[PDB]
Amino acid sequence: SELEKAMVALIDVFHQYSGREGDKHKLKKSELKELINNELSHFLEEIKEQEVVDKVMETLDNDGDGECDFQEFMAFVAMVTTACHEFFEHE
Amino acid sequence: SELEKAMVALIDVFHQYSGREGDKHKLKKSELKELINNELSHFLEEIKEQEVVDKVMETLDNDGDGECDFQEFMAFVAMVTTACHEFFEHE
Numbered sequence: 066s067e068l069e070k071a072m073v074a075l076i077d078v079f080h081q082y083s084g085r086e087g088d089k090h091k092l093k094k095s096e097l098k099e100l101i102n103n104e105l106s107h108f109l110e111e112i113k114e115q116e117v118v119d120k121v122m123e124t125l126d127n128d129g130d131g132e133c134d135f136q137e138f139m140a141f142v143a144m145v146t147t148a149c150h151e152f153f154e155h156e
Numbered sequence: 157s158e159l160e161k162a163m164v165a166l167i168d169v170f171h172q173y174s175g176r177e178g179d180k181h182k183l184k185k186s187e188l189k190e191l192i193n194n195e196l197s198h199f200l201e202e203i204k205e206q207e208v209v210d211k212v213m214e215t216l217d218n219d220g221d222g223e224c225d226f227q228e229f230m231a232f233v234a235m236v237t238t239a240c241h242e243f244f245e246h247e
Contacts, residue, residue: 066194066195066196066197066198067165067166067168067169067195068165068166068169068191068195068196068233069195069196069197069198070162070165071161071162071165071166071233072196072198072199072233072237074158074161074162075158075159075162075233075237076237076238077158078158078159100159104157104158104159104160105157105159105160105163107157107160108160108163124227134238135234135235135237135238135239135241136231136234136235136238136239137234138234139230139231139232139233139234139235139237140227140230140231140234141230142159142162142163142166142230143226143227143228143229143230143231143234144226144227144230146163146166146167146226146230147225147226147227148226148227
């Protein structure tokens with residue numbers, strides 16, 4: 066399905082990128098920024114000064130430690146996806 | 157790209173499933189359930205008697221009303237993805 070195929074791929078990126086940090090399951094801050102660029106470096110060319118890459122650590126980090134988990138992996142693309150398009154509207 | 161291609165797919169399920177029954181931006185407990193199967197019918201099968209579809213309605217719920225948001229959209233697949241995956245891990 067739509068999320069089905071995107072689940073097998075997006076998941077491969079969670080363990081792949083998380084693999085950079087010694088083990089392979091969570092992202093070490095900079096690991097997240099990578100996915101935002103190496104993966105989101107066309108739709109959202111913002112960042113550079115830590116816009117969604119720095120704000121993410123706030124949400125993406127729901128455990129407090131620096132180790133990103135799957136829950137933050139999808140919730141991450143969630144913000145950087147719409148969150149980025151939100152840069153236009155700001156309450 | 158992995159997150160790029162999957163980004164347009166998931167995003168298509170938000171504006172697509174959101175335009176199923178009136179409204180066109182959030183998913184009600186019903187629009188979400190569908191995404192669970194209509195999109196996650198592999199490792200989640202037809203839901204497990206309201207297992208992740210019930211718990212999600214609590215989070216995916218913008219704030220209790222029946223309208224999921226984009227941030228909760230991807231974050232949702234985050235749990236239903238691993239949340240239901242790790243489930244298999246018995247003992």
